[PDB]
Amino acid sequence: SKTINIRNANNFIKACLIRLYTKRGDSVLDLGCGKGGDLLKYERAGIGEYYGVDIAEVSINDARVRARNMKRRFKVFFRAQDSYGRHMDLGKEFDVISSQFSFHYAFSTSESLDIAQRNIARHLRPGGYFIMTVPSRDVILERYKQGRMSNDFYKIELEKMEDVPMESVREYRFTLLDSVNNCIEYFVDFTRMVDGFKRLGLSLVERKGFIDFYEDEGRRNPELSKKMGLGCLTREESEVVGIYEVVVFRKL
Ligand SMILES: Nc1ncnc2c1ncn2[C@@H]1O[C@H](CSCC[C@H](N)C(=O)O)[C@@H](O)[C@H]1O
């Protein structure tokens, strides 16, 4: 109830992102699909097939039910496995691969990132898109320097000092009211990611902050904006939303 606006905002951003890169009869691969909270958004997008994959069986389970009890028109598929630090071969390619609030987990180790980016590349059709929403390292480090690493909605704490450069840290603890607790998150080495992808035939096509992206899409699509209590957002709520950014790669 307290994090309602944040959730609405986030779903909105995801709904818009999905809208911008999907078209009818499209095939989507949803990595880190969680409980399938995007099936509805994809239903409206008129997609033909949806493949959800998540490492946590408990989430893939709730996702199966959601798809099982919803009025959808697309063919669904779910699989509980590791799509980042373990090889993945679903035997097919998709038009759109989506990774919402999950791809930063692929930065566990250099090997994990490599495997992860390779699972993406072999499942993406030539011309396909890989849309994602990941925490922004720049934002997070800049907030660290300002001493504002938290509020009543969330809380973040980095690694140990002891001559350790602020740029040396690779992970941090993240907590979100009514959500994850002391969740270990890995920073997104942006450049390494771009490089890894550029080497697999995928190039950066988009990078925009949640807040900015939010403002733009809401002032362009006042329609889907009325579908919920959008419009404004307190300062404390923006803190949380302002953590993530939109990144979109494309397979030439
Ligand atoms: N290697 C991996 N493969 C697939 N999912 C992973 C993963 N590591 C972490 N995750 C998943 O990442 C998800 C992040 S939150 C899931 C939210 C969902 N994409 C949404 O848009 O609401 C969790 O469900 C977690 O289990």
Curated annotation (Swiss-Prot):
InterPro entries listed in its UniProt record: mRNA_G-N7_MeTrfase_dom, mRNA_G-N7_MeTrfase_euk, RG7MT1, SAM-dependent_MTases_sf
GO CC terms of this entry: nucleus
Effect of N11D: Reduces activity by 96%
Domain annotation mRNA cap 0 methyltransferase: ranges: 1-252
Record-listed S-adenosyl-L-methionine binding positions: K14, G32, D54, D82, Q100, Y105
Effect of D30E: Reduces activity by 60%
SUPFAM superfamilies given in the database record: S-adenosyl-L-methionine-dependent methyltransferases (SSF53335)
Effect of F101L: Reduces activity by 55%
Effect on the protein of changing Y84A: Reduces activity by 83%. Strongly reduced activity
PANTHER family given in the database record: MRNA CAP GUANINE-N7 METHYLTRANSFERASE (PTHR12189:SF2), MRNA GUANINE-7- METHYLTRANSFERASE (PTHR12189)
Protein name: mRNA cap guanine-N(7) methyltransferase
Organism (species): Encephalitozoon cuniculi (strain GB-M1)
